[model samples]
Target: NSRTVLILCGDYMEDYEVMVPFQALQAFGITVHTVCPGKKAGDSCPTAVHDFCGHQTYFESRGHNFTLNATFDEVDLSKYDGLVIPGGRAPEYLALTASVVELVKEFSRSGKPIASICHGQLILAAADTVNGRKCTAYATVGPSLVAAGAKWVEPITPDVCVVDGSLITAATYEGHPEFIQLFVKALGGKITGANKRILFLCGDYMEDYEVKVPFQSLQALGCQVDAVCPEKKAGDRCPTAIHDFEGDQTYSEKPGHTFALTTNFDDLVSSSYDALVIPGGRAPEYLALNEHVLNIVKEFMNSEKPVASICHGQQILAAAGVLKGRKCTAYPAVKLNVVLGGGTWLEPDPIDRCFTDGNLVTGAAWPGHPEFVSQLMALLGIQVSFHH
Candidate 1:
């Protein structure tokens, strides 16, 4: 029996949001058909900026030639076994169709497996089928899901896929792994539990921003948290360096604690770790140059694993060359580092404090820790509770 599924893609379809599940399902011999809005059978999809397979495999595959198997106007809920909606700017336009909404509702009522990633869930919620279902979406759309009667779970842990009957959702791109796992299981595929491994990578600490928040926050969730710093913590007082954000220099003093550069440049690249977290401080500028840190960051970015950096942490990303042309937010000083690295810098708004672009999550500064952690946890599939 050939398993057949449909992917609803539009102009800005996220590369991985479509490819991850497509490839994973295809590995099991599932046949996938892609349908784009306003595209007829034999018409090619509009060009999109996609990070396909964690590589540069953009929709470089030529042709506006895609099989327009069906449209929102012609889809029969019974024809396809499952449906996937990848996030992008497309839904903001396609979701307006009355036919699309009706079709989304029908699919939900049919109880067949439905998966939406990132902004893709917006259309599902707009279709009014997400109520009472525990799901994940890009943090920006979380409030709308809850308002529409769906429960939004935080992605903190490595496996953050939620299954409420036939519906599956992911918080963000980092949730793709768990998202695929849950999607496969929903499709009657084998699901083997893997021991979750979380890796925390930090550099010299000027302030305890990451240590007090992310490390404690992740550990509070029962995640195995290990600290790799430039200095060692032997006594109550750790070595301190004051970073001048404006001047961009570090004021250092005699070392109180002997910090073991446990994982140097080469070591970090070669090390095996489930996730990589780069803490903020003056370290980004220094860590960015260390070929090892850049290598590790690129490794995670390329692997599509959960990678988080806050405050000046964007510097590490910039230094690693991953920030190229991606939207992110950081301290007023570090925002340029992103642009210099080929990334876009948006100031944190009073309404929204943090923003996540795909698997890469960034925070403005120390104050944005809670929101950053919450969104990161939500993406990682971890339920966040201050009590925990």
Candidate 2:
């Protein structure tokens, strides 16, 4: 039997928490419906991007407006086999909704799985569903969950996920790998082709979701994803740019999440990883100027290894001399670079379209993430297998 999942959405939800699993699960063949309280199927909910900064909590910024696919009032609970609760500013207000609390309360008794992350535990605690249950969440949410009689574990890392029966809770979006993996297994789904070491070529000002969605999606499938940047060591943070359509002459750029590097850039050995991912934004403009970056790109392209790049990321490719006579596509403005680099240009007619030629995967923008990541996984022999 095929399974359908209901993802509860509210205004100011975490961009990654709502989108990563939503797309990842669907890519694995599960039907997913996004619904917001009091919002119709076509209504939109804005999102927030979080960047951990210590002092007590994290930094916050604006993200894309996520559109709903299911009307809350029209929902028939029986149709969904699982539930997803996105963490961020929304959970606090969502926990105050009587109908929302009741839905989660009754849904918990169905024995159907629920996956929540970061502050999402607030709703679980509000619904009395975490009572006598072991859970973890964003450090700031610990007291409330404990006050609800849940056995709470203080988290030490950003990648922690705790489970109690069918309930799964994670510290933050950083815990997406385990959070999503557990949610899938709890839904009776099986996965395979998860063994792969993937490397992310990161730089400051790279597109936020472009880098985030693909990296975490790979990790959710058990891929060893390590992000690195020039002159930066592991744990060092790189600030990203939120490139979104604001009805302007071009995409508008704003402040975004501060991404933590996974490994030291100076210690990089190209042969140690199986694949390379290049995210677009203003980052490519400067990253393309680095000799080391150019060398890395050439190494991957010359070796015929899978190199996934999006938007302006091809600038690094075009500058590295790897795009010569290669068929590829990128953000429309970057087409000049493609042609100038002797690359055969493929049109990004739909804006969200991506293409795979030889060992390279190219996309126009973040909108093509599902297809973009799917093709990269295909090239890398990584797959998520699911069935009833």
Candidate 3:
């Protein structure tokens, strides 16, 4: 039986927290329904982008307006196998709603898997569902969770996750890899052929979803994934850019999350990795200028290993001269680069469609992540198969 999940959403919910699992689970073959109180299908909830700056707390900004696909009042609780609660400023007030609390209580009492992150634990505390349960949340929420009788484990790192019975709690979006994997296992999914090591060529201003979704998706599948940028070492951070289309002639951009590199680029050996991934944004423009980055792409292409490049990521492929005679597609604006690089341009007609040519996978943008990552998995022999 295919598992169906319900995600409790509210205005200002964290952007990555909501979209990552929402899309990644669906890509894994689970059915996901997004809903919020007083909202119907097609209605949207304004989201918030939360990122750590040099501030004492995370900085916040407006994010893409997330749309609901399911009506809250129309939901059948019994049909869902699990629940997902994403944290942001919204959860603080959502915890005050009787309906929201009762809904969480219903899921809790039903003994179904419930995954909550960051401030989402507030709702669990409000529903009296975390009492005696071992859980973790954003450090700022630790006091309230303790007061609510939860066995609060202080998160020493932002990537911390805790589980007790059916409850899975994460400190922040950084824990999405484990958080998502645990929830998938809880829903009876099996991951196979995921042991390969994958490397990401990253830089400042890369698309947020482009990097995060595939990185975490691969990690959730149990792959050893590392991200590195030229001149950056492990634990160093790169600023990201949020590129969204909002009826503008061209996509508008905003500041995005600070993506952390997992390995040092200076010590990288191209032969140590099985595949390479490139995320698009303003980063690729500058990265394409680096001879070392070009050589990395050339090394992967010459070795005939999987090279997944999306959006402006194609810019680097063009710069590396690896696209000669290769057929692929990229963001419409980058078509010139592909053609100039001797790559036969495959039109991204639907935009969400992706194409795989040999070991090379190319996508137009973040909207194509499902196919983008799926194709990369095929190239890498990774599979997420379900048990009926």
Candidate 4:
């Protein structure tokens, strides 16, 4: 049998980062095998133990099926076709093992595709595979790569997956879309880089007047606007209509809109889009709860690409756990979520109508959309006349 791609996991690997790629690779017919450090007998396969405490409880709930395919001492490096080391707090411990270091060196020297995200790059660096290679990882891990002779990339520019021969790297979980996109393409899959990709996440009131505006605006800007609705398509007259949380009877579909729900948690993980938009509405309150939704939001933010979230939609970003401690603003109710996520939420006064921190851009709620959307366009360097 052809050897499967081995995913190296530790106790702390980011759950979605590992799962998303593993599933995507599986979808492409690539078998995925999990390898951990310790072994447990009676395990159907060699049990590789991953650190359960290093991840958030919400994430850890995904279950730990990822265990040892083979213990470090028993396996020969020549059996696997490729290697993937995912990050979290575990790499800090996993990198200390002589066997893990030797495995990384063997993989790098063998010329098979090697991929790592976040702190997992530390393992590759320890094995001495990163020296003189241009790679991307979390800002905190850059110094390690530099010391090990690798070039660490900055966080601002948009890069999904950077490849140096068989080595592939992405900065964070938010880079998953780009990361997965590139990995899939490289693995001989039929997916192409040109498929039009757009992400639309709604919050309260954005589905009212501001709804059609962004879709049409993006369409005019040369993108195929795919709508993602929370409701399933059925007898619901305005499935695209914004359901009012304050009172259900007050909702109506905005005029001039034409598109169906093409993306959601299932849509985001399955489809490919070139850009994403978070139209402000009450959507954030519920949307952020879905792990897949949070993953998509994080991918856009960390990739340093253009993303526009107006009003309460910023709350969705806060929910994704990426906004922690960045300077931003939204409706007062959602400010706490941002700060709690490690981001700084500021009040917008007469001077500042919009704010751009890293790849995230936010504006005040509904009334702000006029200037807000325009400001968003300006930040993306997109030119448009409001009169048109």
Candidate 5:
């Protein structure tokens, strides 16, 4: 349980790819130290978001600033139990870095579990680690991995995750659920009691991280997840926003991913899903005004089933009158709403903080997603237990 993994980082790395597994691994009690070639603790790197649009390649866009938690120059490969390499434009350049190549080589030579996704396979190829090893990566990166003498597994889907001993590889961000799950298994972790259905309340402009992180995380635990928004049908797309602190007066915002709804809200039933998830962002402000949305919130509360809300999601809970006398935490700005709703407020000491009371779980913001999902899983009897 004291396992520590090193995440190779760089500017322009995949936003969803890097943050999702980094936090999810930590949620399972793994110690993850993220470092970049020339970055130190507290220093940040701007990430890039990639999604399939109607092109031969993914449509790339700017993402949040990812803060590194360690210094690469201070790295000691001996201290690591595994290596995580996220793909994006970063890996193409990182593969050419002497130190980066050597570091990856060391992990490979040590036979340590190395999980890489997307273009991240470049580092493995450059380090000559994939020779005779079966692996997968973004389709475009296939030629190089094969040239590196790897027994390349052609990805049939974006969600493919190929496992070959200590090497675990995935095609892209969509592969995170199974990719992360396989890496955890390589680390001797086991997920138990996770066959549950979780419903996500979605809307236009929901925080990108808030929805996708918890959505994929629950999926990684083998939970069936359905995302729905009022007035939206299945396959209907909802635009999201990237909300991050960038030394401004408050959190800065930018355009984010196009989230696809999985279930139509009109056909949804409160008793059908095992748990409810309400993510944060600009959508919640308007969603709080929807009487139909409020009814669903109350239904979850009335049933005393697990209902998890983060950041401005508290607005809906407050509007639904379900937070009355309950203890919770949310974005500091929502503290007023919590107070007005007659709910006992729990301070989110660190920005990445969460609290759960009774059948309800609440978080300050997307930064608290790890604990938010972990706590929600606890209520749902989902456990990621490690053996040895």
Candidate 6:
């Protein structure tokens, strides 16, 4: 059986905070419905990308426009098993909506698992749901949470997470791994065989969702995932790109958040990881030119280990000369590379489709993340089960 969840979404909501959990939970076989007041199914909400750019506060930029899957006016509170409130500039105004506040109050009164992140706690405070509840949120929300009778746990770091009964609060999107895991457990879900080590081959300008969704999804499942980029050491960061399809001849690119590498490429031992993941975007074009990177792809492919590549990521696979005779699918623009590499091209008819040939998994783009990550999880023998 599958559990269902409702996410409160609004304009200018944080991109990562929303899409990450929205897709990640679905990959685990949970049904997620996103809704916003005054909006219905098929309506899109404008989202914002919040990033730390050495400023007193984070910087904001236009992000992917999120499409809602449900209508708030038609919602049945009794049907959802849990609730999610994503943090962003949206919360500042969403908290002021009487209808939104009431919906949150109802969810809180139901005593169901409610995962709130960053500015999302503002809604919790507005609904009077945080009273006497221990929680944590973005630093600026501290005073409001405390004034509303919440036992505010000062967030010492961006990754802090605090839980109280059915309420799970996080400081920011950085705490997603733990925050999502806790919410899953609260919903009576159990994870198994997730004790594996995974490695992500990252590069500058990699697709934002492509890298973070699967990376954190594996971590939430209890896997040890390390990200590494060529010539970059641990603690070093790579700038990312947000590729959105907005009615153009090609996808539009926007500046995305900086992704942190967990290991140094120079010190990496290919054999130490159980699987390898490559995210698509502008990065693969340049990364495919590096001999060392090609060697890493070759080692993984030759070893018959799980190798997941999406979108432009297949460009690297093609350059590594590892796609010969392999069947795969990638972003349509990458069809040329796959064909030239002697790989059989499979069409992603719905764009969200992914293909798995042997131990290799290939996806057309970030929209295929659910199937992409699930196929990789199958190769790794990871499973998530819900218990009544």
User: How many clashes (backbone N, Cα, C below 3 Å) per candidate?
Assistant: 18, 0, 0, 23, 0, 0
TM-score of each: 0.46, 0.94, 0.95, 0.47, 0.98, 0.98
Cα RMSD (Å) per model? 16.7, 2.0, 1.7, 19.1, 1.2, 0.9
Candidate 3 RMSD computed on C-alpha atoms after optimal superposition onto the true structure: 1.7
Clashing pairs in 5: none
lDDT per residue, candidate 5, 1-388, as tens digits?
5789999999999999899998888877888999999888999999998977679778888999999999999999999999999998999999999999999988888988999999999999999988899999999899999999999899998899999997999998888999988888888888899989999999999999999999998888888999999999999999999998877889988888889899999998878989999999999999999999999889889999999999999999999999899999999999999999999999998988899999999999888887998899889999887784
CA displacement after TM-score superposition, residue 294 of candidate 4 (Å): 23
- lDDT of each candidate versus the true structure: 0.62, 0.89, 0.92, 0.59, 0.91, 0.94
Ranking by TM-score: 6, 5, 3, 2, 4, 1
**Cα distance off (Å), candidate 5, residue 67:** 0.4
**True-structure Cα RMSD, model 4:** 19.1
- Where is model 6 more than 4 Å wrong at Cα? none
Ranked by lDDT, the better of candidates 2 and 5 is 5
lDDT of 2 by residue, 1-388 (tens): 2889999999999988898888777756678999989999988999998877775667788888787989998888899999999999999999999889988988999999999899888999999988899999999899999999999988889899999999999998888988999998999887778888888989998988888888888888888999999989999999888887768898778888888899988999999889999999888999999999999889988889999999999999999988998999999999999999999999997987889999999999887787788888889887665554
Alpha-carbon shift of residue 36 in model 2 (angstroms): 1.1
Q: For model 1, where is the 10-residue window of minimal lDDT?
A: 58-67
167-266, model 1: which lDDT tens digit per residue?
Answer: 8887655566556556655766542222335666556653343433455445434455555544333222233232222333632222111122333332
Candidate number achieving the greatest TM-score relative to the actual structure = 6
- The digit string of per-residue lDDT tens for model 6 on 1-388 reads 3899999999999999999999889888899999999999999999999998789899999888899999999999999999999999999999999999999998999899999999999999999888899999999999999999999999999999999998999999999999999999989999999999999999999999999999999999999999999899999899999999899899999988899999999999999999999999999999999999999999999999999999999999999999999999999999999999999999998898999999899999998998998899999999999984
Q: Quick one: ranking by lDDT, best first?
A: 6, 3, 5, 2, 1, 4
Whose lDDT is greatest here?
Answer: 6
Clashing pairs in 2: none
